[PDB]
Design a protein around this nucleic acid. Structure first.
Length: 91
DNA sequence: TGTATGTATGTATGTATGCATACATACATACATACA
């Protein structure tokens, strides 16, 4: 299959997925997300030490970039949230 | 006290395999811990 053919098959696949999600009830949505959670729990509890260390390292790097791309309003709101949460814990 | 840094949990998105099923990835949300 060519690079072009693959892209057209996958565009269609993505469109059917989009339709199916847009047709879900809120109950179907929440059942889907519960299964996603379980699948992820199950992957994590059998993770090796090394796989864990790689996952955290990537997570700490996704976080760095995300922070670095934040607008000034987003930064500011993030600091407010942390500052209010710290204040609550102190008091 | 407040912000930088780390991570437990959750999910939007894409797709390999049998349009739906059933994962799998990338990345966010939300708090927690380290540190100035």
């Amino acid at each position: 299959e060519t690079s072009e053919e693959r892209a057209a098959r996958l565009a269609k696949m993505s469109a059917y997925a989009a339709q199916r999600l847009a047709n879900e009830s809120p109950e179907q949505r929440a059942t889907r997300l519960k299964r996603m959670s379980e699948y992820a729990a199950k992957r994590l509890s059998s993770e090796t030490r090394e796989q864990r260390a790689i996952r955290l390292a990537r997570m700490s790097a996704y976080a760095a970039r995300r922070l670095a791309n934040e607008t000034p309003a987003q930064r500011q709101a993030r600091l407010l949230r942390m500052s209010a949460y710290a204040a609550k814990r102190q008091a």
